[PDB]
Write an enzyme that holds these catalytic residues in place. Structure first.
Site, PDB file in Angstrom:
ATOM      1  N   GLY A  24       7.596   8.501  83.474  1.00 48.65           N
ATOM      2  CA  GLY A  24       7.181   8.414  84.872  1.00 48.65           C
ATOM      3  C   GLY A  24       8.227   7.675  85.684  1.00 48.65           C
ATOM      4  O   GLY A  24       9.427   7.883  85.492  1.00 48.65           O
ATOM      5  N   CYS A  25       7.769   6.814  86.590  1.00 45.52           N
ATOM      6  CA  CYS A  25       8.657   5.988  87.408  1.00 45.52           C
ATOM      7  C   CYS A  25       9.579   5.163  86.511  1.00 45.52           C
ATOM      8  O   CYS A  25       9.110   4.304  85.758  1.00 45.52           O
ATOM      9  CB  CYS A  25       7.832   5.079  88.327  1.00 45.52           C
ATOM     10  SG  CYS A  25       8.776   3.824  89.215  1.00 45.52           S
TER      11      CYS A  25
END
Length: 183
Positions: A24-25
């Site tokens: 993800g991030c």
């Protein structure tokens, strides 16, 4: 040709190995790996991996702005350089499956898009087979719903300098609710 390795990462091919991780991030990905495993890894850099070459906005790199368009297929990743005698690939992959929710397709928490997808990008065929094996073994712990894509590394480009060590540079910055070390 292809850019597979970070231009700035500390990496000695005589002793070190590489693994590219998508959780993800990438602020959360780096922060988790540095908070718990910085003393056991050689180096790590955030970047963009396994996307469309034709959708690069520069001949030798891809920007955060371009990736945030959502059509480039590039994944926000952390590339880890490590000594196998200090830490194993399994240990790094076990940690991987503990720091994010790998059941969601093209999203991680509130972060939505193909750039936030779960992924394990192998730098060798031997690593590819091992990663697939570790994913299989982790399935029952995640309700047999692991969406993590396992494929060879196709391309990698360093993220902008300000992205590097972001949450350790700015602790007040955005933290993804799913990015924490699970039991």
């Amino acid at each position: 040709g292809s850019s597979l390795i970070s231009k700035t990462i500390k990496y000695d091919p005589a002793k070190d190995k590489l693994i590219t991780l998508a959780c993800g991030c990438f602020w959360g990905t780096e922060h988790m790996y540095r908070k718990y495993l910085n003393d056991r890894i050689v180096d790590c850099k955030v970047g963009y991996a396994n996307g469309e070459e034709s959708k690069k906005d520069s001949p030798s790199s891809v920007s955060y702005k371009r990736v945030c368009g959502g059509d480039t297929d590039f994944a926000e990743v952390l590339q880890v350089s490590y000594n196998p005698k200090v830490i194993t690939l399994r240990e790094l992959t076990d940690f991987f499956f503990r720091i994010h929710d790998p059941t969601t397709s093209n999203s991680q928490g509130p972060d939505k898009g193909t750039q936030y997808r779960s992924g394990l990008f192998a730098h060798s065929d031997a690593d590819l087979k091992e990663l697939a094996k570790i994913k299989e073994e982790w399935q029952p712990k995640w309700g047999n719903k692991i969406a993590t894509v396992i494929e060879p590394i196709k391309n990698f480009y360093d993220a902008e300098e300000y992205h590097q060590l972001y949450l350790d540079k700015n602790p007040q910055g955005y933290a993804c609710p799913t990015h924490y070390l699970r039991e």
